[PDB]
Paper text:
The central and universal element in genetic recombination as well as in double strand break repair and in the process of replication fork rescue is a four-way DNA heteroduplex called the Holliday junction. In prokaryotes, the two proteins [name] and [name] play critical roles in the processing of the Holliday junction by promoting the ATP-dependent unidirectional strand-exchange reaction known as active branch migration. In bacteria, the Holliday junction is processed by two homo-hexameric [name]+ [name] [name] motors, which assemble together with the [name]–Holliday junction complex to energize the strand-exchange reaction. Here, using time-resolved cryo-electron microscopy, we obtained structures of the ATP-hydrolysing [name] complex in seven distinct conformational states, captured during assembly and processing of a Holliday junction. We show that [name] motors rotate together with the DNA substrate, which, together with a progressing nucleotide cycle, forms the mechanistic basis for DNA recombination by continuous branch migration.
To capture the catalytic steps of this rapid process, we first slowed down the reaction by replacing ATP with an equimolar mixture of the slowly hydrolysable ATPγS30 and ADP and incubated the reaction on ice either for 30 min (dataset t1) or for 5 h (dataset t2) to mimic an initiation and an equilibration phase of the [name]–HJ complex. To test this hypothesis, we performed cryo-EM on [name]–HJ particles under the same conditions but vitrified the sample shortly after in vitro reconstitution (at 30 min (t1 dataset) instead of 5 h (t2)). Only two states (s0t1 and s1t1) could be recovered at high resolution (3.3 Å) from this dataset. In both t1 states, only a single RuvAD3 binds subunit D in the [name] hexamer, implying that states s2 to s5 observed after a 5 h incubation (t2) are indeed actively generated by a progressing nucleotide cycle. At the structural level, state s0t1 is similar to s0 (t2), yet it contains a fifth ATP molecule in subunit F. This finding corroborates the notion that state s0 (t2) can eventually be generated from s0t1 through ATP hydrolysis in subunit F (non-processive). Given that ATP levels typically exceed those of ADP in bacterial cells, it appears likely that in vivo [name] motors first assemble initiation states by preferentially loading ATP stochastically at [name] subunits (s0 with four or five ATPs), to then enter the processive sequential nucleotide cycle (s0→s1→→s5) to promote branch migration. Finally, our findings reveal that [name] motors are most variable in the converter, which changes from a hybrid conformation in the initiation states (s0 and s0t1) to the spatiotemporal continuum observed in the nucleotide cycle (s1–s5).
Numbering used by the authors:
A (entry chain G): 156 to 203
B (entry chain D): 19 to 331
C (entry chain C): 19 to 136, 141 to 331
D (entry chain B), E (entry chain A), F (entry chain E), G (entry chain F): 19 to 330
The structure:
DNA sequence: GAACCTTCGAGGAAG
DNA sequence: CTTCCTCGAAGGTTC
């Protein structure tokens, strides 16, 4: 799951988010098992 | 509210209104969203109002934002994620978006999905973000600064135009019924004639005329009260302010029409250079009363007959 | 106090003063707030004074700030959040607000709402009914979408001799100085049409009357004091007279370029152009021409020279 | 001391000096702060010197700063915050302040208060900072560079004028006592007439003559030493420098007096157009040696008799 | 070394040397710093060289910087804090300094102090920096760019002038010793007459002739070698270039000596309008080959005899 | 996709297409990269599509960027380093990249290596990078604005031109088949005639007419249906657009048909002078609607009779 | 590689080679660098190649940069610190360098030192860097473009001229020898005659002709092949470019043959003034296609007969 | 009518 | 974003 977690964190950083804030945002998500797309999709939605 | 809600109430703009009506029904005749639309025109013609109408005609929710508020790509992608199938995203002043975001908007507009690439190149992987179908509606005062790649994605162009007297008169009549005031059709035309063709200006004049008519009169805007109100305010029958008339008079009386420099003209009327060049000069040029030359401003024959002075080449 | 508090005390500005009364009386009749007002025009004519008069006539407490003090959007948001229904916000020198701040003011003026990003989250604030008043000398510097939202535009005009005469007498009573009507008229003629200048001259004449006289202004003390200050009966200073004299006696009235004329009187070019020419041109003593500037017949008659075509 | 400290020691400027006396005395009778004063005019005429004299006559401490040192609104606010009742603030080269900073003085000068933002977030506030009575004194050579609303706030305007031969002679004699130098009145008058009307120039000539008098002479300045020193410096009895004389000689001998253009004249003397127009030409015009016309520069009758030619 | 180190080695500029010696000697007797001095004049005459000579004669360490190196007010303040009693500060190309910095020297040069803003920003105040006695030396090619208040503060003005053939001949000889090349006295005069009165040009020509004489010669700059080398460089015996020769020849052959307008001439020679007026014409006028007139420029009798045509 | 993939599918541009075919096949026989190629001309003629065809004909991976997207040397360095032997780099709007970016492009194009300064302060070194063989392809709307030294590096030039009716009619049909729209030989001919000769414009109109035929008909684009739709789009039977009509009408009604300059006109109507000159003036000139004169553009009799105004 | 490496390989420019041979050989007897050299003339004549030849003959490394590449003093300082003893620094388009940067070279060229401010805040201090010996090679189009203080510091000047048919023929024959290709004397002569006297063009055309001969021919270049290849491109029967034809055509038809100024003409053809002035106008003038007059450029009868119009 | 000189006005580039 | 300034035009005089 570390790939999907890092993928979401790395993908979020590619959208301009800071590594720390991007990590916290993705780290703040409860389900780690969710697919990389869902992790980034939910994380991006939560940023609104 | 003073904003029309449907094409039934949107006065004027018949050309752009006719085009959008056909396209909206054709899109509704299919399970497809409306093509990306871009609105062109000077400020105050109703671009924002039209955006609300398009959403109401489409029967879909509307998300409103402005170019200056979008500072990072995450905002745009996050905002797009909040959209439901067919939602309309309206971006005002789209010409002011930062270039870093424009390069991402292409994928959403053309593909409705985003792919992010990572890795040095020897080892790499992509992540795909799928977006629901949506329609972007952009409003801009300057078209020339939009890059060719973005311009090519917009499939519909709508030129806004200045309202004509018969339609601008109807906007006044409508607004007068929102308040509790009776206005004679001849009086409504007198305000429209001086509204410089902009609905926002007509509304401002009507408010001022209302205040006079209910304090110095019986609270009714008849042709006589309208003349008195349009006399306390020095707005000429062509819409020229007191200072606008003073500019033309000075050029004709003291310089024989020019050429005259901006600085020389500013000190005569006791005004700042910036005010003359930005507040008053632009409307006088549109009406064709003055022209700009390498040697200075010059008054045209159209100005002579309006101010009432004899002209000679 | 030097600043009038009500329209009954505010002398002159018949055009602006008359219009504002109608709009203020009408607003009270409907129990509504007054539309946003922009005051603009030359320096010292009464822009700031009128802003306080409007607040007193509306019967509201005035909130006050200035363009240079507001440096970021966060400042304006805090100021606006303190507004209560019917309050009046006055921004002096409004032309200095940064572009980042003017954009926030668009929605607040037209829609009474603001959308501010503020752990990052967006807070939507709905403003109560309020009136914004702005004063500036550079109205052309404001953004085009901002000017379009102001509902009342007040352009200030210069005062006439009857009004300046009454202003000087009013100020004399505040200083409890006795001044005769004909002496007061002599100061009005020299005030260049600006109320602040009329007060400045009175302060200087008062000092002379207290040191070189009996502390009373009369047709005799005024003549002496004005001679010491060297202010002509048309309001021309020592340097103003030197410019006209040089043009008439050395160049036969012109045309002469600004550069040549500045070096001759030993003044700086920027100073002659921006500090001395403006009043001479508006009064018609000088005219600019494609080949230079020339002294008009009005200058010859005033300086006491035989005019020659 | 080299700089006069009281009006009794300040020679000349009768108009400005006479006016300031009356306004200072009147303010003392009312026991209130002096109105704001602006001093402007050519270089070296005494603007800075007068600012210190005003403070001594008023009997208060002078707080000094300069335009180039004030770079942001935070700097000016801090200075104003350190004022005490009756203090005098003197700002030299006041025209260099940024335009965004001048607008802070508008309310300070007229109403004695400034509006400042304080706090943060929900605690941010705008508050009036109230100032005690004070006098602002400004000195500048480029008055026209100041904004129209600022000049209108100064209640007293002092325009400096050039000095005359009797006053410059007395100034030279005074300076000759600061340094230990004996000078004959005839030699003092000889230098004064060559000082172009500026006190700073009179002091510079005296310093150069002193160096010569104590190296090439007996350490005393007399008609014999003054004439020799001035010949070495090559400054004409009218104050014309070596290059000033070369200009007139060329115009009179090659162009018969003109009209001649500045470009043509500059090339003949091997100088460049900028130095001739900015350094040498201005004094020649103000003293009547050259006349500017639409056709070019022309040498006047006064120039012919000075160089010794015949005005045909 | 190429650059002279003392007044005994500095050939020419008699008017400047004679004055500087008197002022330097006087300053030593009083044990005081020398007054601020400005060196100005045409390019390559020796302004920078003289600045180092002044320091050697005064016997003190020289601190060096330049106008373009001082980018902001903070830079100048740092340099001034490094001054020690009696130090000499030399600023080359002083006209390049920005106005915001030039106005900081006004106080330093007259009163040896500076106003500075200090503090944590929460609390901050203006304080005076007191400078020790020092001498500012400035060098510039165009004094017209300096503001009037700055030029008025320099106590000693040094205007450089072009060199005569007798003195310029010595400079060529002195340089030959440094290069260890024997030169005949006749050849030294040939190089001098072609050096347009400028020392930098004389050294350049000598270097080129030196290279030629040691590659195809016997390592001696004889009268025969110099003529051959100067022909290769295409330098006329009056220092005229082929372009200069073309101008005069065209005026004599196609217009009978003129008058001819600058536009008309520029076309017939395929030269750019302003290049002819600023690069080639100024030397021709000063030497007297061309004379400007109200109706155009004319070739003088000197140009006829130099080109060999018959004057009429 | 709509755009073709090979020269077999690329319609028109016979000259450019025929030239590139020879050079592309010749490069393969020698097994070497193609020389740098520059494509220029009006917008929408197919410059970008040609780049994809060249890559496909060469059998190489294409990389794409734009002038305004590259802001600093470090940006271009990363792209150029991420290249494989034979790769093709396409840069759109190459005339808009900053002067500092071109520095790296010269050495890369000429010798395939670059020198990058690295470090700051005490760190000041440079790194030499050797690039593999690659082909640069540039595209611009304005060729005369391209930097002279840069334009010399391109070894091949392709000048795009407007398509004719026989070509556009086939293109319109091709696009209709991709959209599966049915169009008659007459209706497809009408759109081509009014498409202003540009494929991008023809594609825009075709998509819009479809929405019309799906309401005012059975989805079949008939000649009569096409004409009613084109009038609804405000498209003249001569291809003039809303802006074209507004330009000519403004000249005739307010300026008597001209002459008027490009700038003066662009001020009355809210359009950028670059857009008028880049997209409107070139077509209007070739079609004879406007003529250029010593004082600007003037509307010809054809324009008057077409617009319905009495000619001069 | 095609670029010549030594003087024996550099064909033509005999006047420049002969002088550089003497100066380089003389500079090698002594253990010192060559004096700073300035090369000027039309673009593309081979001045950059000359810098490489000098570096190889001197036996040192060559570093390259350009005028527009330097925007602030910090850039020039970093470059100079990267030079080894005796290295050669080549600066292209030196006339386009900023004035504030140019004044930093003055000390570097004449004395090999630079005065710079280093650090920030309390660390800000002036440092005196001492550079190792180096040779600067500058390139510019005209000598009149540079300032007098810079031009006076260059010790060698070289004017480069167009190559004649005998030389270009050898250059084409040499270039066609690096590529294993065969070309007949008539083809080489025809290609050179069409090469506008510029070696850069001669090499570009030769590559294209080779490509055509390999695909559309038997791999041998003959007069018949050169004509067809050159006919396929836009090169006219005497080398005129498409831009050249555009200019002549515009002058005759739109200006009636002139007179017209290059400023007003440039804006009508949409070409940048610097390109038409420096690249195209010089050749048209030197070959009689265009004539220059007091009022402006005028097309000669030769142009009329070339374009096929009547010189009425 | 060819040539010089002064003056103003609007761009644009160097802070 | 602003000041500074330079480039281009044109009015007037003289031979
Ligand atoms: N067709 C119309 N009918 C009635 N009112 C209209 C119409 N068009 C514009 N208005 C009025 O114009 C006002 C301003 O309209 P907007 O949509 O803000 O114009 P705008 O183009 O958005 O101006 P901006 O955004 O400042 S550039 C609205 O509040 C309406 O009252
Ligand atoms: N009197 C002199 N005797 C000998 N050499 C001299 C003399 N004057 C100048 N030089 C030499 O001339 C060259 C140039 O002199 P500089 O002092 O650098 O000229 P400059 O005044 O600095 O020129 P600038 O800085 O461009 S205004 C140096 O090699 C000096 O050694
Ligand atoms: N004498 C020569 N013999 C052979 N090739 C030459 C000669 N001179 C120039 N070249 C060729 O010219 C090309 C390089 O031109 P450059 O040396 O760059 O001229 P340039 O002045 O630098 O042109 P730029 O950089 O575009 S201004 C190479 O292909 C050389 O082979
Ligand atoms: Mg709007
Ligand atoms: Mg106020
Ligand atoms: Mg002072
Ligand atoms: Mg020097
Ligand atoms: Mg090169």
């Amino acid at each position: 799951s570390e790939d999907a977690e890092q993928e979401a964190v790395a993908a979020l950083v590619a959208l301009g988010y800071k590594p720390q804030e991007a990590s916290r945002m993705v780290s703040k998500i409860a389900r780690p098992d969710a697919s990389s797309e869902t992790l980034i999709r939910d994380a991006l939605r939560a940023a609104l | 509210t003073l904003r029309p809600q449907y094409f039934k109430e949107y006065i004027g703009q018949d050309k752009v209104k006719d085009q959008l009506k056909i396209f909206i029904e054709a899109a509704k005749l299919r399970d497809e969203a409306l093509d990306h639309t871009l609105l062109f025109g000077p400020p105050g013609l109703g671009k924002t109002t039209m955006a609300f109408v398009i959403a109401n005609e489409m029967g879909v929710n509307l998300k409103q934002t402005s170019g200056p508020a979008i500072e990072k790509a995450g905002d745009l992608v996050a905002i797009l994620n909040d959209l439901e199938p067919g939602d309309i995203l309206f971006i005002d002043e789209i010409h002011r978006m930062p270039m870093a975001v424009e390069e991402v908007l292409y994928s959403a507009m053309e593909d409705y999905y985003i792919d992010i690439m990572i890795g040095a190149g020897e080892t790499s992987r992509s992540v795909h973000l799928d977006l629901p179908p949506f329609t972007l509606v952009g409003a801009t005062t300057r078209a020339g600064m939009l890059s060719n790649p973005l311009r090519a994605r917009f499939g519909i162009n709508g030129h806004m135009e200045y309202y004509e007297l018969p339609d601008l008169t109807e906007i006044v009549e409508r607004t007068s019924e929102i308040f509790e005031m009776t206005i004679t059709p001849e009086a409504a035309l007198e305000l429209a004639r001086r509204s410089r063709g902009t609905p926002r200006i007509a509304n401002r004049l009507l408010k001022r005329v209302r205040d006079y008519a209910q304090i110095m009169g019986d609270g009714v805007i008849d042709d006589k009260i309208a003349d008195q109100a349009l006399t306390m305010l020095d707005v000429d029958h062509e819409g020229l302010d007191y200072v606008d008339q003073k500019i033309l008079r000075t050029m004709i009386e003291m310089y024989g029409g020019g050429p005259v420099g901006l600085g020389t003209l500013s000190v005569n009327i006791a005004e700042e250079r910036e005010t003359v060049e930005d507040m008053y000069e632009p409307y006088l040029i549109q009406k064709g009363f003055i022209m700009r030359t390498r040697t200075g401003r010059v008054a045209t024959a159209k100005a002579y007959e309006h101010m009432g002075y004899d002209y000679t080449r």
